[PDB]
């Protein structure tokens, strides 16, 4: 593993992934385990739920995405979409799904009515924190990964397919696999416009 800061700087968006893993599946699980154990949540509420799809379940997820898009995308746009999914995400080793348990969120809103407007946002925040931790650690072991949002289109089909609770709200999908091309250009705005220091 790199240092925290090195691992963070290493993390990029990869679309050009393949269906190979440098680590055993149990170590991929242990990444997710580590994030879910230690990434913080408001009130220690532990609303985050992670589903790791590998092998044929990974392929099924991307089939669900394609089938969902077929319903809302005219034929030609679909054909381009299909080839792009098939040549990036669906070619990967696996996909991480991030959900937020709405029973927890609703429970906190009911139990702590003074903070009730804050819990949905705090739930989205802890989800994003888990997303960054997983993203970095997957790349640290040598995968490439991207962060996708084909929810809320797919959410009911995903919950149906893997028998997930109806109250798990899908946030993001993170396909990953060994990369075959390097990241491209990234623009950076000046740090001095975005950071102020006052003593």
Ligand X SMILES: Cc1cc2nc3c(=O)[nH]c(=O)nc-3n(C[C@H](O)[C@H](O)[C@H](O)COP(=O)(O)O)c2cc1C
How far from chain centre, in Å, is Cα 23? Answer: 19
Q: Is the dihedral of CA 36, 129, 146, 160 positive or negative?
A: positive
Pick between residue 12 and residue 59 the one whose CB is nearest to Na ion.
12
In this structure, the number of other CB atoms found within 10 A of the CB of residue 102 comes to 16
Strand, coil or helix: 57: helix
Return the one option of ligand X, Na ion, a second copy, none that residue 88 interacts with (CB less than 5 to 8 A, by type). none
Q: Which stretch binds Na ion (CB under 5 A): 93-101, 107-115, 139-147, 178-186?
A: 139-147
Give, as ranges, the residues between 1 and 20 that touch a second copy (CB under 8 A).
1-9, 11, 13
Pick between residue 6 and residue 25 the one whose CB is nearest to Na ion.
6
Return the one option of Na ion, ligand X, a second copy, none that residue 72 interacts with (CB less than 5 to 8 A, by type). none
Residues 56-85, mask of contacts with a second copy (x by CB under 8 A)? xx----------------------------
DSSP type of residue 150: -
Q: Which of 154, 146, 132, 134 is nearest to 177 (CA)?
A: 146
Residue 153 touching a second copy (CB under 8 A): no
Indicate the annotated binding residues: 11-13, 15, 148-149, 186
How far from chain centre, in Å, is Cα 191? Answer: 27
| Dist CA 44 CA 6 (whole Å) | 28
Pick between residue 107 and residue 183 the one whose CB is nearest to ligand X.
183
Strand, coil or helix: 28: helix
- Which residues pair with residue 94 across a beta bridge? 54, 176
Applying CB under 5 A, the residues found at the interface with Na ion are: 140
Interface positions with a second copy (CB under 8 A): 1-9, 11, 13, 25, 29, 32-40, 44, 46, 48-57, 118, 121, 124-129, 131-133, 135-137, 140, 147, 149, 162, 164, 186-189, 191, 194-199
């Amino acid at each position: 593993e790199r240092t925290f800061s090195e691992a963070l700087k290493n993390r990029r968006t990869y679309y050009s992934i393949t269906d190979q893993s440098p680590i055993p599946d149990q170590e991929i699980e242990c990444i997710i385990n580590l994030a879910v154990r230690h990434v913080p949540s408001a009130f220690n509420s532990q609303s985050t739920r992670v589903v790791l799809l590998l092998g044929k379940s990974h392929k099924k997820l991307w089939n669900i995405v394609k089938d969902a898009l077929r319903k809302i995308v005219p034929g030609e746009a679909f054909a381009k979409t299909e080839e792009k999914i098939d040549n990036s995400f669906a070619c990967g080793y696996g996909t991480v799904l991030f959900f937020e348990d709405q029973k927890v969120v609703k429970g906190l809103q009911e139990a702590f009515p003074s903070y009730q407007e804050n819990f949905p946002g705090w739930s989205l925040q802890t989800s994003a924190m888990h997303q960054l931790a997983v993203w970095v650690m997957l790349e640290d072991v040598g995968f490439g990964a991207s962060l996708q949002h084909y929810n809320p289109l797919i959410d009911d089909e995903v919950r149906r397919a893997w028998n997930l609770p109806a109250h798990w709200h899908l946030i993001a999908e993170m396909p990953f696999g060994v990369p075959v091309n390097k990241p491209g250009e990234k623009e950076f705005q000046p740090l001095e416009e975005r950071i102020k220091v006052f003593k």
